[PDB]
């Protein structure tokens, strides 16, 4: 999506997460900014030695190479053939006999 | 879902719910704009069926 | 090796659609266009 | 395989993404017959 | 709550009992399923 | 390496090889002596394992 999302300074509004107590479960969301404790030390406040902000951004710029460039993603997830259907593809029904 | 002006950030990945509607997945599958379209429990051709 | 009957099929396409040449596919080249037989024995050679 | 129901494989996958599943069902099912027919032969000796 | 779907099942039966939970058997029907996606750690009721 | 008396000029940067030994980072990533440590294809936490 480089021509849609990229900017020659870096579109810094996109954040990923670098740290986590544990690998999150399938389809889990985690809204947090609480500082990651890389040292054995406890670490309060906004920053600290070996105390890392748990997010970092992408700098998205058109001047980068392929692979660096921003990708949009959609994951279409669905469940099938086991419950009352609420979505269908464009097949018309026939009569019933 | 595919032309919306800003997407969300991954750490706060948006979820939209879909129901009570008709789904022409040939729209998604045919467009060259998409680099990858990998399906993990259906063939992409079968989505319309 | 040796080969019974050998046929070279030649054409030009957009590179995005090279993947449609794979033996069982369904983009417009593979559809209305040049369709491989599913048990296709042979090679595909492509270049920019 | 993705299911026990053969039609829920066939009505979801194409002719070749299905094979990788259907061959599993053919394999396991056929071993289920070979096991039954072995037990029935060994049993047929007890009754004989 | 399963994978973001909160589900309610319920039953109402008549009874005639003075104090404890009535010994016997019956099953709850599924009443509703809602896509709520929230975390639920804990809960409370609502009197009137 | 980190504690060397003298370091090289970057125009002639030293390229030293390391082997036959154990890579213990505990007196390293966990240590006050550096105002930056960034890894680029591993988690620094994993450098022991
Ligand atoms: C939801 O968060 C609460 C409070 O932190 C926690 O006790 C519970 O384990 C969490 N459950 C899930 C699945 O996130
Ligand atoms: C360097 O070595 C000294 C001991 O010779 C040690 O006290 C110090 O922590 C070391 N520093 C680093 C950055 O490894």
Q: Which residue has the tokens 């070979």?
A: D34
CB of residue F33 inside a 6 A radius of ligand 2 = yes
Task: Name the percent of chain B in helix, strand, coil, to the closest 5.
Answer: 20, 5, 75
Residue found by looking up tokens 């107590």 in the block: A21
Structure tokens at F43: 């988690």
Non-local (6+) Cβ contacts of A59 within 8 A are A9, A10, A11, A12
Which residues does a gap of C–N over 2.5 Å follow in chain C?
A: none
Write out residues 1-49 of B within 8 Å (CB-CB) of A: 1-2, 7, 9-13, 15, 18-25, 35, 41-42, 47-49
What does the angle CA B2 – CA B5 – CA B7 come to, to the nearest 5 degrees? Answer: 70
Q: Which of A17, A23, A38 to mutate to test the interface with F (most CBs of F within 10 A)?
A: A38
A94 Cβ contact list (under 8 Å, min separation 6): none
Residues of D in contact with A80 (CB under 8 A): 12
* Residue A52, CA distances (Å) to B29, F12, F30 in order: 41, 33, 12
Chain C: touching chains (3 or more CB pairs < 8 Å): B, D
Cα-to-centroid distance, E18 and ligand 2 (Å): 77
Chain D contact for C38 (CB, 8 A cutoff): yes
**3 state DSSP class of D37:** helix
C16 and B32 in contact (C-beta within 8 Å)?
Answer: yes
User: Which residues neighbour F26 within 8 Å (Cβ) at sequence distance 6 or greater?
Assistant: F48
Q: Are strands B21-22 and A87-88 parallel, antiparallel or unpaired?
A: parallel
Across-strand partners of A36? Answer: A52
- Which pair of structure tokens corresponds to residue A65? 């190479």
CA trace torsion D2, D7, D11, D13 (10° rounding): 40
The approach used to solve this structure was cryo-EM
The continuous run of DSSP H or E covering E33 comes out as strand E29-34
Q: Which ligand is nearest to the CA of F25?
A: 2
Mark yes or no for CB contact A74/B48 under 8 Å. Answer: no
């Amino acid at each position: 999506s480089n021509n849609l999302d990229s900017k020659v300074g870096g579109n810094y509004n996109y954040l990923y997460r670098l740290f986590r107590k544990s690998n999150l479960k399938p389809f889990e969301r985690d809204i947090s900014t609480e500082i990651y404790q890389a040292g054995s030390t406890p670490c309060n406040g906004v920053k600290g030695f070996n105390c890392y902000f748990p997010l970092q951004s992408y700098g998205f710029q058109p001047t980068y190479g392929v692979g660096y460039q921003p990708y949009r993603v959609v994951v279409l997830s669905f469940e099938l053939l086991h419950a009352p259907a609420t979505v269908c593809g464009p097949k018309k029904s026939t009569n019933l006999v | 879902v595919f032309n919306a002006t800003r997407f969300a950030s991954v750490y706060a990945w948006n979820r939209k719910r879909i129901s009570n509607c008709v789904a022409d997945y040939s729209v998604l599958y045919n467009s060259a704009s998409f680099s990858t379209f990998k399906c993990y429990g259906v063939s992409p051709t079968k989505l319309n069926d | 090796l040796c080969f019974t009957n050998v046929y070279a099929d030649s054409f030009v396409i957009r590179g995005d659609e090279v993947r449609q040449i794979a033996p069982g596919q369904t983009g417009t080249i593979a559809d209305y266009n040049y369709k491989l037989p599913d048990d296709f024995t042979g090679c595909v050679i492509a270049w920019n | 395989a993705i299911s026990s129901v053969l039609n829920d494989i066939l009505s979801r996958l194409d002719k070749v993404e299905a094979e990788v599943q259907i061959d599993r069902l053919i394999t396991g099912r056929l071993q289920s017959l070979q096991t039954y027919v072995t037990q029935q032969l060994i049993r047929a000796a007890e009754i004989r | 709550n399963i994978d973001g779907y909160f589900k309610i099942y319920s039953k109402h039966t008549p009874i005639n009992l003075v104090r404890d939970l009535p010994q016997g058997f019956s099953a709850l029907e599924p009443l509703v399923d809602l896509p709520i996606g929230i975390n639920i750690t804990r809960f409370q009721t609502l009197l009137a």
